[PDB]
Amino acid sequence: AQNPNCNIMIFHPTKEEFNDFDKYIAYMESQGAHRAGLAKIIPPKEWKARETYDNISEILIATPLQQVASGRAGVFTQYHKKKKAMTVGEYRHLANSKKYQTPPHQNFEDLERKYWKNRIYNSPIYGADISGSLFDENTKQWNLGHLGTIQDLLEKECGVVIEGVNTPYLYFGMWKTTFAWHTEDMDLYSINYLHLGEPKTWYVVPPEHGQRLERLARELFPGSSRGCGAFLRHKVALISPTVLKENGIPFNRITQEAGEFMVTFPYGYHAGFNHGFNCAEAINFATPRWIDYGKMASQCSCGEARVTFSMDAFVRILQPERYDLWKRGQD
Numbered sequence: 001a002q003n004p005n006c007n008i009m010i011f012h013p014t015k016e017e018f019n020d021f022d023k024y025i026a027y028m029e030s031q032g033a034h035r036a037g038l039a040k041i042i043p044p045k046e047w048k049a050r051e052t053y054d055n056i057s058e059i060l061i062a063t064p065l066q067q068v069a070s071g072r073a074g075v076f077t078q079y080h081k082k083k084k085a086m087t088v089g090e091y092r093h094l095a096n097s098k099k100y101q102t103p104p105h106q107n108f109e110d111l112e113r114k115y116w117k118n119r120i121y122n123s124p125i126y127g128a129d130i131s132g133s134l135f136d137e138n139t140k141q142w143n144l145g146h147l148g149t150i151q152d153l154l155e156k157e158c159g160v161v162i163e164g165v166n167t168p169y170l171y172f173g174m175w176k177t178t179f180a181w182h183t184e185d186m187d188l189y190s191i192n193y194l195h196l197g198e199p200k201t202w203y204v205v206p207p208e209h210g211q212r213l214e215r216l217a218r219e220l221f222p223g224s225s226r227g228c229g230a231f232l233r234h235k236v237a238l239i240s241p242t243v244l245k246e247n248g249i250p251f252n253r254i255t256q257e258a259g260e261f262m263v264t265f266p267y268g269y270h271a272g273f274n275h276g277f278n279c280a281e282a283i284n285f286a287t288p289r290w291i292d293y294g295k296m297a298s299q300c301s302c303g304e305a306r307v308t309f310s311m312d313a314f315v316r317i318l319q320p321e322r323y324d325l326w327k328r329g330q331d
């Protein structure tokens with residue numbers, strides 16, 4: 001078995017190997033990359049996402065989210081308070097202000113220490129989940145707006161044509177902006193490109209150990225667990241590496257820098273934080289290997305998770321027994 005310790009693997013495809021996206025994902029899996037839940041892909045030196053980032057300041061962040069924490073430094077939830085709209089140029093200025101800027105630090109490890117010590121005491125503002133793309137239309141390789149759609153994959157594998165669309169999302173971050181422990185909708189893959197700015201630190205649990213994370217989460221968030229049998233789908237809970245290590249949960253960590261892709265694999269729980277002002281683009285995708293994960297994915301039916309239009313068909317076709325309850329939670 002390749003990669004039996006479930007380490008995060010880093011890949012350096014050549015420009016030739018960068019042509020065929022599906023083929024390269026399958027290659028990474030042949031080397032055991034999925035066992036970690038997360039892989040890094042460093043693009044060939046010849047490649048670029050677009051020519052420059054000099055003209056992005058007028059993008060609108062319609063609903064910036066202030067991420068307010070509750071709990072203790074290593075075990076907390078966050079809620080999202082909606083703020084007034086602002087442009088990316090306004091948000092960048094805000095991120096660089098004395099109130100929100102990255103503190104002085106020695107290295108990524110020191111900054112990580114500072115994040116876990118101090119995150120709860122601040123409420124950073126995240127420009128998340130903005131439909132759109134920063135890939136140039138002329139970028140032919142690993143262009144996250146030109147991937148094969150999940151609806152097409154389901155149709156190719158299973159023969160059933162379904163409604164729905166699959167488009168990318170932009171994320172504008174600042175110091176301490178946080179993504180809570182989650183797997184993707186329907187335990188899909190994700191791919192994330194860090195277009196510009198400061199790094200993003202990731203934590204990940206191997207898919208084969210995801211249920212160990214879930215059991216810890218039920219212990220640590222006992223009211224939330226009574227409320228919902230899949231409350232990590234709410235995407236609000238944080239658990240620090242120190243707490244994970246104290247509880248014997250297998251995990252790994254890695255820091256993504258600008259110009260790098262990360263791929264999350266089906267049922268790979270992940271969480272993390274931004275180092276400072278940045279912009280990422282991410283999208284879900286599927287492969288043939290995903291189908292069995294989609295059929296087994298948990299679902300929130302309590303009403304909290306509320307998701308896209310396109311998840312309906314995935315539930316309806318892959319999980320017909322669950323469909324009626326889940327749809328009630330959507331309505």
Ligand SMILES: O=C(O)CNC(=O)C(=O)O
Nearest residue numbers: 171179190191192280282
């Ligand atoms: O970058 C973020 O805030 C969150 N991204 C992801 O969870 C992802 O790409 O799957």
Ligand SMILES: [Mg+2]
Nearest residue numbers: 056057058059
């Ligand atoms: Mg602009």
Ligand code: NI
Nearest residue numbers: 183184190270
């Ligand atoms: Ni994710």
Ligand SMILES: [Zn+2]
Nearest residue numbers: 228300302304
């Ligand atoms: Zn729920």
